Design a protein around this ligand. Structure first.
Ligand SMILES: [Zn+2]
Length: 258
């Protein structure tokens, strides 16, 4: 497959190789704050990252993934809309060429400059590959980024990017604490959806935090020096690696907060 975010292989083309692109539970979506309803059935959300073990950072040609040891329950998400335990496998971001776009979810049609996705898989299915085949297989914690003050906890990521400029490059990335990327409040919206990149599988419980984090212009400008291309190939800046909002269809977005 040769999908991407270019002039000829972008999101509008994905359906040809991945027909589920036009499915009933595709992500991302626009979150209409005046239709989303507070849900008192939601249990407390628990983000348990104290024992997180990051390992490596990889430029995969469509974003970079910070990868974790998910061989045991070291960093998990539980509670909220979730039943059981979801293990952190990786995080990554989506960002724009300019600050006025970049996020995948939108809030009353507002686009943020970027969006962070912490991806977790349901341990009841044993491994990630099995989990993506199930409607309750993944939980993705989505966090909006706006440009303002620097995010201190992000700078260790920013500073390694020069070492993974091109597709296929990776670097050791141990001892990174994902708690440093959270906002103050864990208020969220939740709905059932999908992966936002091919294969677009409809396996995700989305938990999208209401409070954005702030990063500095200098930090985002470093993300925009990454490359989609491999070493020595014509330079294609890694920008605008976001899928636009997809139809909500029958779905309901629930708020954790009154
Ligand atoms: Zn993502």
């Amino acid at each position: 497959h040769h999908w991407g975010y270019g002039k000829h292989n972008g999101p509008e083309h994905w359906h040809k190789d991945f027909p589920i692109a036009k499915g009933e539970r595709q992500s991302p979506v626009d979150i209409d704050t005046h239709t989303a309803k507070y849900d008192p059935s939601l249990k407390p959300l628990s983000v348990s990252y104290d024992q997180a073990t990051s390992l490596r950072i990889l430029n995969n040609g469509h974003a970079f993934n910070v990868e974790f040891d998910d061989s045991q329950d070291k960093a998990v998400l539980k509670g909220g809309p979730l039943d059981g335990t979801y293990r952190l496998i990786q995080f990554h971001f989506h960002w724009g060429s300019l600050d006025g776009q970049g996020s995948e979810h939108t809030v009353d049609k507002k686009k943020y400059a970027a969006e962070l996705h912490l991806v977790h898989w349901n341990t009841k299915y044993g491994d990630f590959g099995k989990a993506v085949q199930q409607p309750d297989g993944l939980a993705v914690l989505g966090i909006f980024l706006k440009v303002g003050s620097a995010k201190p906890g992000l700078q260790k990521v920013v500073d390694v990017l020069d070492s993974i400029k091109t597709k296929g490059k990776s670097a050791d990335f141990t001892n990174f604490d994902p708690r440093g990327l959270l906002p103050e409040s864990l208020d969220y919206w939740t709905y059932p959806g999908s992966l936002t990149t091919p294969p677009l599988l409809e396996c995700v419980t989305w938990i999208v935090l209401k409070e954005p984090i702030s990063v500095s212009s200098e930090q985002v400008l470093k993300f925009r020096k990454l490359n989609f291309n491999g070493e020595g190939e014509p330079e294609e800046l890694m920008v605008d690696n976001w899928r636009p909002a997809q139809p909500l269809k029958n779905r309901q977005i629930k708020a954790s907060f009154k």
